[PDB]
Design a protein around this ligand. Structure first.
Ligand SMILES: CC(=O)N[C@@H]1[C@@H](OC(C)=O)[C@@H](O[C@H]2O[C@H](C(=O)O)[C@H](O[C@H]3O[C@H](C(=O)O)[C@H](O)[C@H](O)[C@H]3NC(C)=O)[C@H](OC(C)=O)[C@H]2NC(C)=O)[C@@H](C(=O)O)O[C@@H]1O
Length: 375
């Protein structure tokens, strides 16, 4: 490991774990190592300085020591870059990572905690970004968003990541026009795989997904305060082997208030007793009102609902099923090979143990249509 090539064992070990729509990402493979030696927001040896250097050519960024990096603005991640916090405890505080117009990016083993300090995002994959792998992250306390994949971005895998202690967690595409399908051609190309993630002590949008093609398998949603998942507007999703666990009688752990653009907002603690039955919003409910009000003038021929195929999802504790198959024939049958596990309480335990920015290893356990010899 003089360089991040296929012969470097920790490069090879990481790349062996790839699966899903982001599985082609190699980040800084074949480029240079850059070792972050300063924990400052900016300056020599900083993460920000490393990312600037990474604009010049493929870079695999590692950290010299455990560090807390208090960010004043969001970091911008260029193409062909890996940010690799393995072997160290690295936390980004108050701001996060923007992946804008970038191809071929791997983010692994980092903590990002917004502390509700400012209106920003932990991981923002936007504006024609592609081939992005978000792995073993620990993301929390963003007053805007933990993670977006939006605005013509595609070919993304989110794996083994702990999303916690935050309100509006994840958007898979957004809506920025009154005509709900105005950006459909642009955003329907989004292909995103979510597997082995842990959504714990969050409020909502776990994820909220529209327009694109999504595969959610073997995720654990636990102790949400408002709703778990939401799908609408011809999202096409295969939702399989996930575990939803909740209890209507538990102590609230939300902050007293949330900062917002319009000022201070109350928390969602009063919804705890009705949250378990809202494992998801009903299919299409996120945008149904707008769709029904606007369909007269816009003449929508696309569905307000998502096309869903659901298999082998658990509903534990007080959690109750909501989502059912709807036009399942139009949901994806992913072209790739993936390591699907039967949904059991033992799987939930595995996810709680290993999801996030953890020290233990998560090698792939694989059959399916995309698996040569093992269909
Ligand atoms: C139990 C229940 O579902 N009650 C809701 C109301 O929820 C409240 C008052 O908490 C209310 O729902 C609207 O407000 C929600 C909220 O305050 O968090 C959600 O809104 C957030 O997300 C939507 C979204 O489309 O995803 C928008 O971006 C909102 O701006 C955002 N608001 C804030 C403060 O962050 C509800 O949206 C979703 C998707 O669940 C939002 N509902 C709608 C249709 O816009 C109420 C209402 O319609 O205003 O509906 C129920 O009674």
């Amino acid at each position: 490991c003089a360089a991040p090539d296929e012969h470097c064992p920790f490069v090879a070990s990481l790349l062996a774990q790839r699966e899903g729509y982001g599985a082609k990402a190699t980040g800084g493979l074949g480029g240079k190592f850059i070792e972050v030696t300063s924990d400052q927001d900016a300056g020599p040896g900083t993460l920000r300085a490393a990312l600037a250097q990474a604009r010049k050519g493929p870079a695999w960024i590692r950290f010299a020591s455990d560090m807390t990096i208090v960010l004043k603005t969001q970091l911008r991640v260029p193409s062909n870059t890996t940010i690799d916090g393995r072997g160290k405890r690295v936390a980004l505080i108050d701001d996060g990572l923007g992946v804008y117009g970038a191809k071929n990016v791997i983010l692994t083993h980092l903590t990002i905690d917004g502390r509700l300090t400012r209106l920003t995002q932990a991981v923002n994959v936007a504006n024609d970004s592609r081939d992005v792998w978000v792995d073993h992250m620990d993301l929390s306390r963003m007053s805007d968003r933990l993670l977006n994949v939006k605005n013509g971005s595609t070919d993304v895998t989110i794996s083994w990541t702990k999303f916690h202690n935050s309100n509006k967690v994840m958007l898979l595409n957004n809506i920025t026009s009154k005509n709900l399908f105005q950006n459909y051609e642009r955003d329907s190309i989004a292909r995103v795989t979510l597997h082995h993630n842990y959504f714990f002590n969050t409020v909502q949008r776990n994820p909220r997904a529209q327009f694109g093609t999504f595969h959610l398998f073997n995720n654990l949603l636990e102790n949400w305060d408002f709703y778990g998942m939401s799908f609408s507007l011809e999202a096409k999703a295969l939702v399989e082997g996930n575990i939803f666990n909740n209890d209507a009688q538990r102590k609230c752990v939300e902050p007293e208030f949330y900062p917002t653009v319009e000022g201070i907002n109350v928390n969602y603690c009063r919804y705890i007793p009705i949250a378990p039955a809202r494992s998801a919003l009903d299919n299409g409910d996120s945008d149904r009102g707008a769709y029904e009000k606007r369909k007269a003038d816009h003449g929508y021929t696309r569905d307000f609902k998502a096309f869903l195929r659901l298999k082998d999802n658990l509903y534990l504790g007080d959690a109750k099923p909501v989502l059912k198959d709807y036009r399942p024939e139009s949901a994806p049958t992913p072209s790739y090979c993936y390591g699907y596990e039967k949904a059991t309480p033992e799987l939930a335990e595995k996810i709680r143990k290993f999801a996030g920015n953890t020290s233990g290893d998560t090698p792939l356990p694989r059959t399916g249509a995309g698996c040569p010899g093992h269909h």
